[PDB]
């Protein structure tokens, strides 16, 4: 079990740690989050009380270093930092724990939600989507645009998701126009899985990361990416059986975790109706179709 200490909490803020959240008051004696499960990536995220504009946060993996949070009054945000002095860090944490100044990562033993949302998400792949090589952790916020959004403007602050575009020479083999546009299996299996992602685990990892950024930061381009990656699978007639079964599980837990009140902005009616009712895979997503029909029947 790992710990992310806070130097202090000088501004009132709602702090998220994965799917949990808690409110911290201005100058409240808060000094961090303990008992964080080892073995998963995590995200620690922030929404200031005085300006709910810009949700922002940090993806990290406690196996890759000792990380802490410190508010910067010049840039006006809570910043993640790495402490290289291991003994200084252990002594800081032990003091804050003895004074019980830390919240406990509140995981129910039965509860596999976070695993199910991050099964294929790796910190090394996150750091290729979010480029800032001097840090072991990755900053994301509500406003960051994707490479594909910038093609249609600061490149260093972009989300370098894999560009998917159904009307592109990459997606469409010369002479197979109709076939490839109506059945995207070539684009999924040859171009994307064999060519770019190398395997379905990396594809699912990017899909899951895209969803989590959409959910936690309201990042619009991430939501676009999540839906495009779903649509590419659903619009393929030929998909490995194990990929379809895993996709059904992935989407089930995503739909389950979505805040009910954000479904209007996080779910694209067209993609979901197409995927569940018109596509090649309309009959292959049983768990996802069942939770969608019981939780968001209005969208459909």
């Amino acid at each position: 079990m790992n710990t992310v200490p806070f130097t202090s909490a000088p501004i009132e803020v709602t702090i998220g740690i994965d799917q949990y959240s808690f409110n911290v008051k201005e100058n409240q004696p808060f000094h961090g989050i303990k008992d964080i499960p080892i073995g998963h990536v995590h995200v620690i995220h922030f929404q200031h009380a005085d300006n709910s504009s810009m949700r922002y946060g940090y993806w990290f993996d406690c196996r890759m270093g000792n990380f802490y949070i410190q508010y910067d009054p010049k840039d006006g945000l809570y910043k993640m930092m790495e402490e290289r002095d291991g003994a200084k860090f252990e002594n800081i944490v032990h003091n804050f724990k003895e004074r019980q100044m830390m919240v406990s990562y509140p995981k129910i033993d039965e509860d596999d939600t976070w695993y199910n949302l991050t099964e294929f998400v790796q910190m090394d792949k996150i750091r290729k989507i979010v480029r800032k090589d001097e840090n072991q952790f990755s900053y994301v916020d509500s406003s960051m645009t994707t490479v594909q959004e910038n093609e249609l403007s600061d490149p260093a602050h972009s989300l370098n998701y894999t560009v998917i575009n159904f009307k592109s020479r990459e997606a469409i083999r010369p002479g197979h126009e109709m076939e490839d546009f109506l059945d995207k299996s070539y684009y999924l299996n040859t171009v994307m899985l064999q060519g770019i992602f190398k395997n379905s685990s990396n594809y699912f990892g990017e899909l899951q990361f895209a969803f989590l950024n959409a959910m936690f930061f309201g990042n619009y381009g991430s939501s676009l990416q999540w839906h495009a990656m779903i649509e590419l699978i659903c619009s393929s007639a030929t998909v490995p059986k194990h990929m379809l079964d895993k996709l059904d599980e992935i989407l089930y837990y995503q739909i389950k975790t979505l805040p009910e009140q954000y479904s209007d902005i996080l779910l694209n009616e067209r993609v979901w109706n197409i995927c569940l009712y018109s596509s090649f895979q309309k009959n292959s997503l049983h768990n996802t179709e069942k939770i969608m029909e019981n939780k968001y029947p209005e969208l459909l």
């Binding site: 009307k167 592109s168 020479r169 469409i172 010369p174 126009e177 109709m178 546009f181």
Partner: protein, 237 residues
């Protein structure tokens, strides 16, 4: 974006553009089978690809053999249209290739966009105009060229005959759409109007009759009456 009455004069500027109409590509007769079921029999069709400024009509005849052994023919027909238009563009010298292609039905947008990916600078546009190009097969010589075909073939026609020697391309297009609208609303009467007078002939190298300027005004008036007549007979007005 979309092409409509507001930007109608754009059709007659000096940027090369083509209308593509796919309504006569897949044509069938519906009939009963010996067992009393229903079946279709395809007949020859055509892509109607028209430069509205020059009158040049690239008519790509679609022979029924292209449908043999194929499924979902109405969907295939859109992609076949897009394939043939793309092949036409590639066959033209660069300085003759269009800068825009306007499709008369929105269902042609994605097929044509996908087939034209190699041409990112050619704009594929829909239109809000309800153009009467389906009635192209009411032009006798055109229908004849399509029905007699025994293999695929594309023929270059001028749909304005020699009209541009005397009128502008705006006026010629207006005359064409009026003739086609009339033929579409009542083919028999329209054709009666156009041929009633045996002294006005269609030249061997022309599609429409050799009307004087004054006779075209009479003809044009009679087509408006017909279109209004039918609009009454239809709606009871």
């Amino acid at each position: 974006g979309a092409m409509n009455s507001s930007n109608y004069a754009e059709l007659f500027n000096n940027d090369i553009k083509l209308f593509v109409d796919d309504t006569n590509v897949y044509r069938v007769t519906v009939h009963k089978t010996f067992e009393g079921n229903v079946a279709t029999k395809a007949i020859n069709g055509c892509i109607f690809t028209l430069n509205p400024k020059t009158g040049h009509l690239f008519l790509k005849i679609i022979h029924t053999s292209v449908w043999a052994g194929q499924k979902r023919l109405s969907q295939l027909a859109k992609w076949k249209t897009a394939e043939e238009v793309s092949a036409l563009v590639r066959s033209l010298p660069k300085e003759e290739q269009p800068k825009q292609i306007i499709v008369t039905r929105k269902a042609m947008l994605d097929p044509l966009e996908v087939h034209m990916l190699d041409f990112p600078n050619i704009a594929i546009r829909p239109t809000e105009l309800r153009l009467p190009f389906s009635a192209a097969m009411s032009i006798d010589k055109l229908s004849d060229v399509v029905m007699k075909a025994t293999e695929p073939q594309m023929v270059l026609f001028n749909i304005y005959d020699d009209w541009l020697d005397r009128i502008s391309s705006y006026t010629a297009f207006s005359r064409l759409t009026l003739l086609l609208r009339a033929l579409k609303t009542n083919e028999e009467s329209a054709k009666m109007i156009l041929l009633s007078d045996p002294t006005i002939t269609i030249k061997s190298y022309h599609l429409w009759p050799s009307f004087t300027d004054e006779q075209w005004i009479t003809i044009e008036s009679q087509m408006r009456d017909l279109i209004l007549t039918e609009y009454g007979r239809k709606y009871n007005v």
